Amino acid sequence: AQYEDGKQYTTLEKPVAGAPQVLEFFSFFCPHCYQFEEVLHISDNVKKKLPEGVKMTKYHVNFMGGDLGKDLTQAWAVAMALGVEDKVTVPLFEGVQKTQTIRSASDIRDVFINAGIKGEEYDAAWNSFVVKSLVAQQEKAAADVQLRGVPAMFVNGKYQLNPQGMDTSNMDVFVQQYADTVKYLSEK
Numbered sequence: 001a002q003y004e005d006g007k008q009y010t011t012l013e014k015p016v017a018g019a020p021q022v023l024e025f026f027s028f029f030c031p032h033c034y035q036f037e038e039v040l041h042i043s044d045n046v047k048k049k050l051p052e053g054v055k056m057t058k059y060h061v062n063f064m065g066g067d068l069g070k071d072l073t074q075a076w077a078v079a080m081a082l083g084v085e086d087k088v089t090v091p092l093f094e095g096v097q098k099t100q101t102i103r104s105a106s107d108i109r110d111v112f113i114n115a116g117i118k119g120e121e122y123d124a125a126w127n128s129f130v131v132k133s134l135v136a137q138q139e140k141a142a143a144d145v146q147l148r149g150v151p152a153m154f155v156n157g158k159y160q161l162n163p164q165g166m167d168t169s170n171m172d173v174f175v176q177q178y179a180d181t182v183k184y185l186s187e188k
Helices: 031-039 042-047 066-082 085-098 105-114 119-126 129-144 171-186
Strands: 009-011 022-026 056-060 152-155 159-161
Touching: 022 031, 022 042, 022 129, 031 042, 031 085, 042 056, 042 171, 056 066, 056 129, 066 085, 066 105, 066 119, 066 129, 085 105, 105 119, 119 129, 152 171, 159 171
Parallel strands: 022 056
Antiparallel strands: 009 159, 022 152, 152 159
């Protein structure tokens, strides 16, 4: 067929109960994740084709970057709690990988301050139990899909996107296939 198990996607041998409809994992340390987000715009292209009533969820992972990696997961939790993902995603990627001016938790915070989040607001979120639970949620989700690497995307806790079973020639053809595959899986 056009879409095939083992090709554009694979099927989790152990399906995840109550999973987000579309779940992306990434790290601000991850070079391919930088490409996915800042050059290929995978998240955006997926969301543009999702059925109505399908929300997209994105989680950070700890296993890259040691202490700063975990700081970044906690800062991503702050971004989710405050609803400012679309204000900090680009400067966090660029700060870690382009300028490499993000080397500590304080450097992460600076990104939020520069983007207009009050220090007061950031600090209260950072130290909140709501953010600790969002960190725990992200770690939980990774365990649930038995995550081994990033970037990664899962649909309805059942299917895993398989970009290596897609075409790599045209970035754009690749992005279109990826986005079309997510849409197909969402309706499956």
